[PDB]
Structure formats: structure tokens, C-alpha cells
């Protein structure tokens, strides 16, 4: 929610980085608490994994 539901994003020429740790990467929460993604492309791993 901190990144996906932020009140303000940076411009592309001056992008920001946030580190994520000590948490559960549950991506199903984004079904209720986030806008639908028009793009969701994984290169490293399959999104199902």
C-alpha cells in the first residue's frame, strides 16, 4: 500500500527506490486494495510462482 496507494509519485528522470524486507509477499491482497494492472510482466520468474 505504501507504494501502490501512495499520494505522490516521483518523475521518471528522478525515480525513487525502496527496500522491502522482513515481510510476506502476498500479491493476492492487490485484488481488493489496488487498481487493476494493465501491465504485469515478469522476466526473472513466472508470476504464478
Amino acid at each position: 500500500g505504501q507504494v501502490f496507494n501512495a499520494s505522490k509519485f516521483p518523475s521518471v528522470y528522478a525515480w525513487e527506490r525502496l527496500r522491502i524486507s522482513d515481510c510476506v509477499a502476498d500479491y493476492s491482497v492487490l485484488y481488493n486494495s489496488s487498481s487493476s494492472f494493465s501491465t504485469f510482466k515478469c522476466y526473472g520468474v513466472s508470476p504464478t510462482k
Binding site: 487493476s36 494493465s38 504485469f40
Partner: protein, 197 residues
């Protein structure tokens, strides 16, 4: 597609919003892929979709998707039940008991909504290609049968080059072709004249 014959064809159809169209595929994740409609990894078929904002965005429309579920659906399953979802597990009532939600969520399909929230009609065509009688064939025209000459051929989409002669072999009631130990086709049933070559 126009050169093939299929032993079975099924058409699965429904309405989703634009942004959900990308989920209608093998190996996908998301609300639709997980809770509403799923295809197998070994999917044989075609997915078609088009924008119908001018038709399916009327005041009287009623389109829903499942938002809450315990677990995931299997490929080609349906679930049309409608009971309250208890996020703590088990069941609940009233919907005022804190952890109770309505399992279905409506699509806000208004005619003035931006692209990605507009309704799309999806049709999925599932195909089978077995050693069995064709039920659906493309718009091909047939020719005279030539025998004892090297020639190209196509029987219900089954192509190759060779010499066609009369067979003395017998086929099972629903056998269309036969193959030997090298998977070389040495016999075919003519689609119009019930004779093995």
C-alpha cells in the same frame, strides 16, 4: 485454421473488463485467472476478444466477477454459488459481522468510463486433433482421387507426399488413419468414399 479439420470444438464465452483480458491465457495469475476462469498449461485453441462499450454499458447491465474465494479453481471449472465469505475461515451471516464480504463484485461498466474499465466480449475456442471423425472442417475444396502416381495429398488436413493405392487392411469403426512402428502413415480412410487406401 482454414486448412485443418477438428474432431471436437468448444466455444467458451463471457464478459470481462479490458484490463482483465490479458488474464485469459495459460499460466496466468489474477482475480480472473484464479477465481473465475482458468485455462490449462497445455491449451490448444484460440482466444478472441473485442470492445463492446457501446452495447454492454447500458443502465440495465449486470456484470459480476468473483473477488473473494478460499483457494483456487481448476481449469474449465465453474462456481456460481453465492454465500458470504468469512475472511477468518468457515461461514458467516448478516454481512455486518466484521469479517463478512459479498463474494461477487460488480463491474462499474458505465459508458463514460476510461479505456481498461470498458467491457470486452471474450470467446475461447478449444480444439482437439485426434485420430477420430472430423466434426468441423475449414473451407477447402476437394479434388478427384488419383492412384498409382507420386502426388501430394491432404485428407482432413493430414498431408504428405507419396503413391496412393488400394488397401486390403481393415480399420476400426472410428479410425481415420493407421501408422507403423516408425510412426509412418501407411493407411488412410477416404472422407467421402468409405475405402481404405
Amino acid at each position: 485454421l482454414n486448412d485443418l479439420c477438428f474432431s471436437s470444438v468448444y466455444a467458451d464465452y463471457f464478459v470481462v473488463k479490458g484490463d482483465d483480458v490479458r488474464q485469459i491465457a495459460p499460466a496466468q495469475t489474477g482475480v480472473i485467472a484464479d477465481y473465475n476462469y482458468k485455462l490449462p498449461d497445455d491449451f490448444t485453441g484460440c482466444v478472441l476478444a473485442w470492445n463492446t462499450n457501446s452495447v454492454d454499458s447500458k443502465q440495465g447491465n449486470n456484470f459480476y466477477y468473483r473477488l473473494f474465494r478460499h483457494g483456487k479453481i481448476k481449469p474449465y471449472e465453474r462456481d456460481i454459488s453465492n454465500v458470504l465469505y468469512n475472511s477468518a475461515g468457515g461461514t458467516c451471516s448478516s454481512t455486518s459481522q466484521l469479517g463478512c464480504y459479498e463474494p461477487l463484485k460488480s463491474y462499474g461498466f458505465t459508458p463514460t468510463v476510461g479505456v481498461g474499465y470498458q467491457p470486452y466480449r471474450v470467446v475461447v475456442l478449444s480444439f482437439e486433433l485426434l485420430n477420430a471423425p472430423a466434426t468441423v472442417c475449414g473451407p477447402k475444396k476437394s479434388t478427384e482421387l488419383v492412384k498409382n502416381k507420386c502426388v501430394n495429398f491432404n485428407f482432413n488436413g493430414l498431408t504428405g507426399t507419396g503413391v496412393l493405392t488400394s488397401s486390403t487392411k481393415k480399420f476400426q469403426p472410428f479410425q481415420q488413419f493407421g501408422r507403423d512402428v516408425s510412426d509412418f502413415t501407411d493407411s488412410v480412410r477416404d472422407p467421402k468414399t468409405l475405402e481404405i487406401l
